[PDB]
């Protein structure tokens, strides 16, 4: 009956826990106790982008690491040229309430989702010369919290419906649906090989999904509160989560266990966004105390701070070539550090 | 300058983009943004009807040369803590409460009472860390039903220690006071309570008057006078 299945699930959880404990012969700190610490990271605001007139909720770099897309709840999706701070495009969204945006690796498309439960795919390169809504993927019963392009035709979205979805943009239908979460999925991170992706939810759980199969492979429950942000390690065999627990955590897929906890006593606010440097040595986490913190990934000590913003750092993104960092905030300014 | 012809044209295009953004933003700052909230039905839909499947439903209506954008977020059966901060800058929060729900019990939970639910929702939303300054326009709907039903069922079944005469006026005033006393910030914000008149169009007029007083007080606070 229900009791038997509950006890079976509990004993399976205990089995997984003891397997993890057996596999945890050493910690990351004692492995990297002798490595030279990263020097004090002094990053200066190289660029400032001032177009937005409301809180910026998400930004995403283009794969060329020069174009940027940022979404604000003024009802604007702006594509910037980060080198010249020029506004390449300004897209008026149908729904002003957007909390995510994505730039296609091809660069032809962008995506925007929010409280309207719809992921709008906008086609940037059109003969008419203006950005038009290529598609409106609907079917989520909750807000879209993150969307990511697998390629020009496939997209992956995470919603407050406690589920993720893989959509074929051409047909407009959900190719697959991932329903393992028990809370609002607040983040998403496609793997570099684009065959797996990790989704963190409000149930303090991050699940690794296979896009091709549609089944969760691993689950991670090291956090204490909502997982607001998640990002894959560059090699694809690890990822990092930021939560309202005021901590960041590094989980390794192969070890199926957390490796490092980036937490400080002076820090009590949540993490809106996390990201890695190109080498993976630096974890850049955007906190709610208006300051982004740059942590050494291998050693838990904090390398530096980015104190440019006067409000919560809502979005954080590193260029593919690793040259710059882009931090958006609720003060309506995105700032390109280097 | 050192900019080539195409770079100069791109800069000119960016300047035009900035001008369009500025014009759109200044046009948007001239519109009243009202966050519409309620528990279940609570006549909220009727309030939307008075003034005119999933996700936010935005109703845009003009009244006396003032443009209101009302955001009904009822459908978002999601975690409110993860998206309620999107409405930090709304002019006012129109909170609809069904009076007839005083005796009705929650369909979802038989133990829970619908009225005390709205009271819990109101306590969560008026004392929210994001809505410290925004004023709440309380809309007590279905006054006729409540007036007809209070005779059959006393209000004491919902509210303990209510020593009223079970007349419509006394019970309605007691409910209004009970909702208005949940306000733990009586200086920063004000609660404009109105008993919804379904027949007449006085609902949009009351919203307009409350919004004008919110605008006046916001101007006076920004000027630093009070």
């Amino acid at each position, epitope marked *: 009956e229900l009791d038997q299945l509950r006890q079976e699930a509990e004993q399976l959880k205990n089995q997984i826990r003891d397997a993890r404990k057996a596999c945890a012969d050493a910690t990351l700190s004692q492995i990297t106790n002798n490595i030279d610490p990263v020097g004090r990271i002094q990053m200066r605001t190289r660029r400032t982008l001032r177009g937005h007139l409301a809180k910026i909720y998400a930004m995403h770099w283009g794969t060329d690491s020069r174009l940027l897309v940022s979404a604000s709840q003024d009802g604007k999706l702006i594509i910037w040229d980060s080198y010249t701070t020029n506004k390449v495009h300004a897209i008026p969204l149908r729904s002003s309430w957007v909390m995510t945006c994505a730039y296609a690796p091809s660069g032809n498309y962008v995506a925007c989702g929010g409280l309207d439960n719809i992921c709008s795919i906008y086609n940037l*390169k059109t003969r008419e*010369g*203006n950005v038009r809504v290529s598609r409106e993927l609907a079917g989520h019963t909750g807000y879209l919290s993150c969307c990511r392009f697998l390629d020009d035709n496939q997209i992956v979205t995470s919603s407050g419906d406690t589920t993720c979805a893989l959509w074929d943009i051409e047909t407009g239908q959900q190719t697959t649906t991932f329903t393992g979460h028990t809370g609002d999925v607040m983040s998403l991170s496609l793997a570099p090989d684009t065959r797996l992706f990790v989704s963190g939810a409000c149930d303090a759980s991050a699940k690794l999904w296979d896009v091709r199969e549609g089944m969760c492979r691993q689950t991670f429950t090291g956090h204490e509160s909502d997982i607001n942000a998640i990002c894959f390690f560059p090699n694809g065999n690890a990822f990092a989560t930021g939560s309202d627990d005021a901590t960041c955590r590094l989980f390794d897929l192969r070890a199926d266990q957390e490796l490092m906890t980036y937490s400080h006593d002076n820090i009590i606010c949540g993490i809106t966004s996390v990201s890695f440097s190109k080498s993976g040595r630096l974890l850049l986490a955007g906190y709610d105390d208006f300051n982004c913190n740059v942590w050494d990934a291998l050693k838990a000590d904090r390398a530096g701070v980015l104190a440019g913003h006067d409000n919560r750092v809502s979005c954080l993104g590193v260029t593919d070539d690793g040259m710059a960092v882009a931090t958006g905030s609720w003060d309506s300014f995105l700032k390109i550090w280097n | 300058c*050192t900019l*080539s012809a195409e*770079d100069k*044209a791109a800069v000119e295009r960016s300047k*035009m983009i900035d001008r369009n953004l500025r014009e759109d933003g200044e046009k948007a700052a001239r519109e009243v943004k009202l966050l519409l909230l309620g528990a279940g039905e609570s006549g909220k839909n009727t309030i939307v009807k008075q003034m005119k499947t999933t996700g936010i439903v935005e109703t845009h209506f003009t009244f006396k040369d003032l443009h209101f954008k009302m955001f009904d977020v009822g459908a978002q059966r999601s975690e409110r803590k993860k998206w309620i901060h999107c409405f930090e800058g709304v002019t006012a929060i129109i909170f609809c409460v069904a009076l007839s729900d005083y005796d009705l019990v929650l369909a979802e939970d038989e133990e829970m009472n619908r009225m005390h639910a709205s009271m819990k929702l109101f306590d969560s939303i008026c004392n929210n860390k994001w809505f410290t300054d925004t004023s709440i326009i309380l809309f007590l709907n279905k006054k006729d039903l409540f007036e007809e039903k209070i005779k059959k069922s006393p209000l004491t079944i919902c509210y303990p220690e209510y020593a009223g005469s079970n007349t419509y006026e006394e019970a309605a005033a007691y409910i209004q006071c009970q909702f208005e006393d949940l306000n733990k910030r009586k200086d920063t914000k004000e609660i404009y309570t109105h008993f919804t008149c379904s027949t007449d169009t006085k609902n949009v007029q009351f919203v307009f008057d409350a919004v004008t007083d919110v605008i006046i007080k916001n101007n006076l606070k920004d000027c630093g006078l009070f």
Partner: single-chain antibody
Amino acid sequence: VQLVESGGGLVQPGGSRKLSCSASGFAFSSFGMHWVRQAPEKGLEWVAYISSGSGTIYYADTVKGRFTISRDDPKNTLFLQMTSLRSEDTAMYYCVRSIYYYGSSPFDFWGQGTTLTVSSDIVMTQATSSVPVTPGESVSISCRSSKSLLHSNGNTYLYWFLQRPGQSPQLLIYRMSNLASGVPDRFSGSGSGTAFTLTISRLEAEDVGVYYCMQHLEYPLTFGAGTKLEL
């Protein structure tokens, strides 16, 4: 998209004529607009340019002070008013659209053009002309610039256009190497910074025509003398 020109015809020398360019199928407001004239049996010559929103206007020194360019965005129309029509203003005028942002393709669509007959700077050189190459064999058209088109930002503003016989010119290569959308992969562009080559992998019946090299480094935009291809 389409741009249709009108208003041309026979005009006495010294008279005034107005050329109109009706644009449909694209956001005319976001596109800067050029007027480019081609003399009978001669190469292309840039005439005028008006930016989006009419912020900047440029004229060729040949027609500066005699031609006035304007745009009616609500009507989606482009106007060129010509006051003193000399004997050198006989030509077919093309209305070209160009949108300038990062990664855009200016000079993408060229109108059909209208004939205007009167009663009677960086220089681009294309020495090679009338190449008799046969289809199936790769051919390289060479063009040369007096001033280095390579810029500080790294963009080389050298455009390759193709004009098939009895047809409006069409964009082939933008910014030296970038290939225009809708253009067969057979075309490729390369250049050191002063001498550029356009190589055709294979030749078909539609590749025959006149190939022009334009510079967009600075105004006036200069077209090289056309390089003609014959089977």
